[PDB]
Amino acid sequence: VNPTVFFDIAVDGEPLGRVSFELFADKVPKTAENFRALSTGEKGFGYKGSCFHRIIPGFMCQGGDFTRHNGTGGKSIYGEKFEDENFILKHTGPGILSMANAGPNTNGSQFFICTAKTEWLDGKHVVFGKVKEGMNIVEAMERFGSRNGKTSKKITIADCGQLE
């Protein structure tokens, strides 16, 4: 039932590995659906080609900005931003896929992959998925981000899509 999507990560174009995720459509349908129709491209815009502009070691890896790529753009399948469907799932550990935002009800297309337990974001960020396999790719993926978050090299989503 639950949708499975993935990202083929590249470090400067040189492929590193794949990372698949499980979207919790059983908890956050609209939130999950958005990310699904964004990883496939079935609306003419998505993650394939975009990068991880903000990677903070021990914290998370952020991406989703396919328009401005500097943490300023990106959009959902319902236009610009969208509401905070709910706050039922928590940032319980590394692998968690949660929505990035600029305050409540501002969910667009940016998201982040947690590389640690980030419970302080609970109630402020909508969790909607989790790395199924490839967290090991996010290990090394995380060595390319400074304390402030600025990467050392270009971490790109070489390819992505839905498998089930």
Binding site: R54, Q62, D65, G71, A100, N101, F112, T118, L121
Partner: peptide, 6 residues
Amino acid sequence: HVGPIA
């Protein structure tokens, strides 16, 4: 101005 913190 999108991003998690802390």
